[PDB]
Amino acid sequence: YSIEVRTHSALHVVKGAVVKAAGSAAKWTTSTYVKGNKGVLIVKAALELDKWAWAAMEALANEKVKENAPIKIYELPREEAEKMFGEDMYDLFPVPEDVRILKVVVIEDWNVNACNKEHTKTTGEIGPIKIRKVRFRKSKGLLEIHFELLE
Template sequence: MTEELFLGDSYLREFEARVVRLDGREVVLDRTAFYPGGGGQPADRGALGIGPVRAAVVDVRRAGGEIVHVLDRPIPDTVRRLRGELDWERRYAHMRYHTALHVLSGVIWRRFGAKVTGGQMRADRARMDFSFPGEWTSEVVGEIERLTNAALAEERPVRVYELPREEALENPDLIRTQVNLVPERVELVRVVEIEGIDTQADGGTHVANTREVGRMEITSHKSKGRRNKRVEFVLR
C-alpha cells in the first residue's frame, strides 16, 4: 500500500520516499505526494530523483493499493530512495479549480436543486454538468456566476475530515453526491466541507480557503438535453 500524503496535506510540494519497486519506467514508492488522478482531477506531474539521477514524472495512476509513477526515462535499479518534486504551478491550479467546482456545485444545489452529473478540470479551465430542473436561460447562468463569486469572496474555510461509512451514508448532502460510489471495503469516508456551501465525499486536493480561488468567469454554457446542462469557466 502506498501512503497517500496528499490526503493529509494538499500543499506538500516535496517529499522523500523509499523505492518499493522499479519496473522499467514505472516506480512504486512507499509514500507519495503525487495525486494519481480521479474525480475529474488530472494526475500530477513533476520529477523524481536523487543526486545526479533525475527523471520527469509524466503520469501517475492507481494500481490496486499502490500508486505507480511513470517516468520519461528508466532510472538505475540500484536506487533505493528518491526525492519527489511536484509541478506546483499545475497542482495548485487544479486545487483552485477543484474547490471552485465544489462551490459551484453547492450554489446550484442550494439555489436550484440541481444535482451534478459530471465535471472535469484542467490547469486553465473547468466544466460542470448537472441535471437542471427549470428553464435554462442566460439570466439563470448569470445568476449562477454571481452567486458563486459571492460565495468565493466570503473567504469560507475548506475543511477535510473523515467519517465512518455508516454516518456518511446518513448525511443527505453526501448521499446526493458520490458517497454511495465509495467501495464497500472503505470504512472511513474522506469528506471535503466548504463551510455553509458544500459537503462532499472527495479524494482530491483543495485550497484551504475560498479566497485562494479567485473569481470565476463562465465562458460558455449549453443544453445537452432536456435536463442535462453544462457550464464551462475559467478563474481570474
C-alpha cells in the same frame, strides 16, 4: 497553490452556486473535470432555467469566493458520513463498497461532497471565477457549466 488544486476547489464552489441559482432540481453531478485553469461541471437538470441563471451562478460563485469561507474536511467512517450528510455528498458514480472511510468536503450551507483530492483551505484562494459557458441539453436533461480561473 496549484492552479488545478484551485480549479478543483472551484468545482465545489460552482456546484453550490448552481444549486442555489436553480434549487435541488440541478443538484446531482454526473461528471466533472479540471484541466489547468478550466473546469467543467455537468449536472442532471429537471428543468430548463431562466435567462438570469447563468449570470446568477457566476455572481453567487464569486460572492462565495470573497466570503473566503473555509473549505472543511471530515474524514469519517462511511456509515457516519451517510447519516451526517446523506446521499447528497455523492456524485453519480459508484464508490466501491470496500471504501469504508470517506473524506468529505463541506462548504457550509453551500456544498457537501465526498472527494479525496487536495483543496485550498478557504474559498478566497480560488480567485475570480468566470463562467464562459452554460449549455442545457434539453433531451438528455443535462446542464454543463464551463468556468475558468486566473493563473
